Amino acid sequence: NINLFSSYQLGELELPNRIVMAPLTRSRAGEGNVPHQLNAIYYGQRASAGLIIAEATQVTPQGQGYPHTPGIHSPEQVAGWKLVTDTVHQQGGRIFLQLWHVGRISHPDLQPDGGLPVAPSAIAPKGEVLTYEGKKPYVTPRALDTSEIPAIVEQYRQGAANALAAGFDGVEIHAANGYLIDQFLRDGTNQRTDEYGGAIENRARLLLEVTEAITSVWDSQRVGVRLSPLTTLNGCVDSHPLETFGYVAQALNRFNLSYLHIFEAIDADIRHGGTVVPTSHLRDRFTGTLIVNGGYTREKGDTVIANKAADLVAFGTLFISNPDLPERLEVNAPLNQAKPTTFYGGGEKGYTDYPFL
Ligand SMILES: Cc1cc2nc3c(=O)[nH]c(=O)nc-3n(C[C@H](O)[C@H](O)[C@H](O)COP(=O)(O)O)c2cc1C
Ligand SMILES: [Cl-]
């Protein structure tokens, strides 16, 4: 009898429960995009999670797309992240860093020397993007040269090496939500005509090469990957999600990863008139630990574990508002209500001041 409170063996890590804190961008980094003591308090308050996945963290300056997100490319950033991992470890928790590059979802104002965002193909996102001077129209990203792809892979390798020096327990590759890797994955954002575009094995190549590089730094059982097969976020869609994502699920087995993490889009059924990509399709193809996410509750999480449909269940929104989410779920306590106005930016309010039971 397994449920949301069963322990789990994730490589050498002993998880006390199956509850994961999903990665959550909070945009509360200081000068130089460096984490600080407030961030350490925030993660320390949530250390009862089976596993924390820290917010998306850019691996290189050009990988930033929103003001005040932390990076993992500089020594000052490693030192600030050390404050966080030290606090989490003091509180008996475990934490992985989510490794980010936004690709086209950025603006020159956020880029070194005011340069263009990079991407697989020169396709401007629609609408406006937040800068330090409010919202401005997106521009068109520069399509990377074939010869530049190794430099991208190397930025991820260095980001993963920095995470290791910062004292994380592992890393998660952000291959979801329409950011750089996802932009290569999906045919809606990738119309390249080299070995990184066209056929599925080409579109998956960047993910696979990034994963290979990162497993040269970390033991593979401390490296996860996140996918979001049916998001439409950031204008990133694939025309054959079942085949695309079913292929990636199988291709990742080579690496003996920590886990595959699926964000199941909350609006996919209502948009698509049904389910184009049941998570079972991926559960059956990826042979290791599966984390599922999107709108879970105590009862929904228990069910998926009991049914063997997933091993771990990640909660995003509820972990914003309930630092002791595991205990509250365990005893069927009232949950605090999440306050969207304070999700992004600011300080303690709506960040470290949600109460414990
Ligand atoms: C404020 C906020 C920030 C998020 N930031 C990230 C992020 O940094 N990386 C990521 O992969 N997903 C991110 N997401 C998506 C969440 O991790 C999660 O997949 C989503 O909220 C659905 O799960 P939930 O219903 O438990 O909240 C974010 C969502 C929210 C609400
Ligand atoms: Cl995200």
Residue numbers in the entry: 14 to 370
Quote the authors verbatim.
To generalize this engineering approach for crystal contacts, a non-ADH-homologous enzyme was selected to apply the established strategies to the Nostoc sp. PCC 1720 ene reductase (NostocER). This oxidoreductase from the old yellow enzyme family (OYE, EC 1.6.99.1) catalyzes the trans-hydrogenations of activated alkenes, demonstrating its industrial relevance as a biocatalyst. As OYEs are strongly dependent on cost-intensive NADPH as a cofactor, Mähler et al. engineered NADH-accepting variants (NostocER1) by exchanging NostocER loop regions at cofactor-binding sites to ER loop regions from Achromobacter sp. JA81 and Acaryochloris marina with a higher NADH affinity. For this study, the NostocER1 Loop1,5 variant (NostocER1-L1,5) was selected as an example protein for the rational introduction of Lys–Glu interactions at crystal contacts to demonstrate the impact of rational single amino acid exchanges on the crystallizability of proteins and enhance protein crystallization.
Reducing the protein concentration from 10 g L−1 to 5 g L−1 led to a decrease in the crystal amount for all the tested NspER1-L1,5 variants, with D352K being the mutant that formed crystals of the smallest size but in the highest amount. Mutants D352K and T354K crystallizing in the same space group P1211 as the wild type showed, again, an excellent agreement in crystal packing. The crystal contact at position D352K is not conform to expectations and is quite complex, with more than one amino acid residue interacting with D352K within approx. 10 Å. A sodium ion (lilac) also seemed to participate in the interaction complex. Introducing a lysine at any of the neighboring NspER1-L1,5 positions Q350, (D352), and T354 led to an interaction with the intermolecular amino acid residue of E25/27. The neighboring NspER1-L1,5 mutants Q350K, D352K, and T354K led to an interaction with intermolecular E25/27 and an increase in crystallizability (Section 3.2, Section 3.3 and Section 3.4), with the strongest impact for T354K. Validating the molecular structure of the NspER1-L1,5 mutants, for 67% (4/6) of the analyzed crystal structures, the correct intermolecular interaction partner was assumed (except for D352K; and Q263K: E146 instead of E44, data not shown).
